[PDB]
Scaffold this active site. Sequence first.
Site, PDB file in Angstrom:
ATOM      1  N   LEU A  15       0.810  -1.211   0.000  1.00  0.00           N
ATOM      2  CA  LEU A  15       0.000   0.000   0.000  1.00  0.00           C
ATOM      3  C   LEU A  15       0.846   1.265   0.000  1.00  0.00           C
ATOM      4  O   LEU A  15       0.347   2.330  -0.375  1.00  0.00           O
ATOM      5  CB  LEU A  15      -0.933   0.011   1.212  1.00  0.00           C
ATOM      6  CG  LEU A  15      -1.923  -1.150   1.312  1.00  0.00           C
ATOM      7  CD1 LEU A  15      -2.711  -1.072   2.611  1.00  0.00           C
ATOM      8  CD2 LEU A  15      -2.858  -1.157   0.112  1.00  0.00           C
ATOM      9  N   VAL A  17       5.349   2.764   0.778  1.00  0.00           N
ATOM     10  CA  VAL A  17       6.666   2.604   1.385  1.00  0.00           C
ATOM     11  C   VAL A  17       6.954   3.852   2.207  1.00  0.00           C
ATOM     12  O   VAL A  17       6.942   4.970   1.678  1.00  0.00           O
ATOM     13  CB  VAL A  17       7.753   2.357   0.326  1.00  0.00           C
ATOM     14  CG1 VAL A  17       7.576   3.304  -0.874  1.00  0.00           C
ATOM     15  CG2 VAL A  17       9.135   2.504   0.931  1.00  0.00           C
ATOM     16  N   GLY A  18       7.203   3.668   3.502  1.00  0.00           N
ATOM     17  CA  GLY A  18       7.429   4.801   4.381  1.00  0.00           C
ATOM     18  C   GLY A  18       8.747   4.802   5.127  1.00  0.00           C
ATOM     19  O   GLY A  18       9.756   4.284   4.635  1.00  0.00           O
ATOM     20  N   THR A  19       8.741   5.377   6.328  1.00  0.00           N
ATOM     21  CA  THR A  19       9.958   5.565   7.104  1.00  0.00           C
ATOM     22  C   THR A  19      10.572   4.236   7.528  1.00  0.00           C
ATOM     23  O   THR A  19      11.641   3.857   7.038  1.00  0.00           O
ATOM     24  CB  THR A  19       9.671   6.425   8.339  1.00  0.00           C
ATOM     25  OG1 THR A  19       9.119   7.683   7.929  1.00  0.00           O
ATOM     26  CG2 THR A  19      10.952   6.676   9.129  1.00  0.00           C
ATOM     27  N   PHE A  20       9.912   3.532   8.445  1.00  0.00           N
ATOM     28  CA  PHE A  20      10.450   2.318   9.043  1.00  0.00           C
ATOM     29  C   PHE A  20      10.165   1.063   8.227  1.00  0.00           C
ATOM     30  O   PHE A  20      10.539  -0.033   8.656  1.00  0.00           O
ATOM     31  CB  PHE A  20       9.892   2.153  10.460  1.00  0.00           C
ATOM     32  CG  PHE A  20      10.268   3.273  11.389  1.00  0.00           C
ATOM     33  CD1 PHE A  20      11.574   3.734  11.446  1.00  0.00           C
ATOM     34  CD2 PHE A  20       9.314   3.873  12.196  1.00  0.00           C
ATOM     35  CE1 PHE A  20      11.925   4.766  12.299  1.00  0.00           C
ATOM     36  CE2 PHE A  20       9.659   4.907  13.050  1.00  0.00           C
ATOM     37  CZ  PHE A  20      10.965   5.354  13.101  1.00  0.00           C
ATOM     38  N   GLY A  21       9.523   1.189   7.079  1.00  0.00           N
ATOM     39  CA  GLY A  21       9.250   0.041   6.237  1.00  0.00           C
ATOM     40  C   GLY A  21       7.975   0.244   5.445  1.00  0.00           C
ATOM     41  O   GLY A  21       7.309   1.272   5.539  1.00  0.00           O
ATOM     42  N   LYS A  22       7.647  -0.777   4.658  1.00  0.00           N
ATOM     43  CA  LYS A  22       6.483  -0.729   3.788  1.00  0.00           C
ATOM     44  C   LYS A  22       5.205  -1.038   4.563  1.00  0.00           C
ATOM     45  O   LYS A  22       5.221  -1.676   5.620  1.00  0.00           O
ATOM     46  CB  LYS A  22       6.627  -1.723   2.635  1.00  0.00           C
ATOM     47  CG  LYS A  22       7.838  -1.503   1.746  1.00  0.00           C
ATOM     48  CD  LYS A  22       7.931  -2.596   0.694  1.00  0.00           C
ATOM     49  CE  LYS A  22       9.199  -2.471  -0.133  1.00  0.00           C
ATOM     50  NZ  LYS A  22       9.373  -3.636  -1.045  1.00  0.00           N
ATOM     51  N   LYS A  38       1.539  -2.229   9.005  1.00  0.00           N
ATOM     52  CA  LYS A  38       2.740  -1.402   8.981  1.00  0.00           C
ATOM     53  C   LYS A  38       3.925  -2.229   9.465  1.00  0.00           C
ATOM     54  O   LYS A  38       3.886  -2.792  10.564  1.00  0.00           O
ATOM     55  CB  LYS A  38       2.565  -0.167   9.864  1.00  0.00           C
ATOM     56  CG  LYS A  38       1.828   0.999   9.225  1.00  0.00           C
ATOM     57  CD  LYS A  38       1.779   2.177  10.190  1.00  0.00           C
ATOM     58  CE  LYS A  38       1.148   3.411   9.569  1.00  0.00           C
ATOM     59  NZ  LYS A  38       1.998   3.999   8.498  1.00  0.00           N
ATOM     60  N   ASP A 132       1.733  16.827  13.072  1.00  0.00           N
ATOM     61  CA  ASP A 132       0.535  17.635  12.924  1.00  0.00           C
ATOM     62  C   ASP A 132      -0.401  16.965  11.929  1.00  0.00           C
ATOM     63  O   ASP A 132       0.014  16.136  11.115  1.00  0.00           O
ATOM     64  CB  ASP A 132       0.880  19.051  12.459  1.00  0.00           C
ATOM     65  CG  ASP A 132       1.497  19.892  13.558  1.00  0.00           C
ATOM     66  OD1 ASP A 132       1.083  19.739  14.728  1.00  0.00           O
ATOM     67  OD2 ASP A 132       2.394  20.706  13.253  1.00  0.00           O
TER      68      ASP A 132
END
Length: 267
Positions: A15, A17-22, A38, A132
């Site tokens: 869904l 790909v972010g900071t600490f993983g997909k 997550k 925020d």
Amino acid sequence: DGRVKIGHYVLGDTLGVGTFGKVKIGEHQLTGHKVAVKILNRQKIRSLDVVGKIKREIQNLKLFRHPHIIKLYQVISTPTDFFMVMEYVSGGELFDYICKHGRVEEMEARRLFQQILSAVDYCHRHMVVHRDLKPENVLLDAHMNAKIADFGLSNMMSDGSCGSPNYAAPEVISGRLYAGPEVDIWSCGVILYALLCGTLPFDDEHVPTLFKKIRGGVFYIPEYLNRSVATLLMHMLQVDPLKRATIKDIREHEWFKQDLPSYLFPE
Ligand SMILES: CCc1ccccc1C(=O)Nc1n[nH]c2c(C)c(F)c(C3C(C#N)=C(C)N(C)C(C)=C3C#N)cc12
Ligand SMILES: [Mg+2]
Ligand SMILES: [Mg+2]
């Protein structure tokens, strides 16, 4: 095996790909219930020295009970990863709906704004805010209900609207070293405006002039807009946060109180 299975869930499509993983869609092997997992790589967590902070954002988000905040079902711990099993919502981003459909009806805008304002108030009351409110992180479900990712530094996801710096409050643009809950009031004012007008209040293709209009605080109030909700928008989109509306001000406004469901603000 052959499939990435964690707990009772088989992981599938990515869904985002972010900071600490997909973030991958999960499916319960027994019930078939879709879910969003997550994946938090623990080596990435330790490289930022936020181990004690993430474990307290998770333990705090685990005690969240709000129908319009993305729910955390469970956390599965392997030696290498944290698997946050969270609610899956398929309606997409709220602003993608607005930018494709236009303005919604006044009752639908009121219902959605009451849900969003309730979730924001719940986060400010029940957690230490590391993020925020990002109006791009406001999702919808299949029942057209608002679904918000909590303001923890784990929800820095937005992968997989009519602008991006458009949702930046003036004190955020000016680089003010301190910012409180009034920043989220501004974002909710931007959200309310788009729900009622179909566009963003300070939109401009030239980014420098976009920042100039936000600092000026002048936005177009259409004549078709309700005169009462116009006062609410002017109060929420105040450039000076000291003069900006608060959650109690919005909760007392005649437009907000109309057809307000009982479960949103039990306080
Ligand atoms: C909006 C896309 C979309 C479009 C159409 C259908 C589904 C989605 C979708 O993804 N739904 C999510 N369901 N549950 C999520 C959780 C727990 C997340 F954590 C995130 C995560 C994320 C990713 N990947 C995205 C795209 N965004 C913008 C946010 C706010 C996330 C966070 N936090 C998504 C879903
Ligand atoms: Mg100039
Ligand atoms: Mg007018």
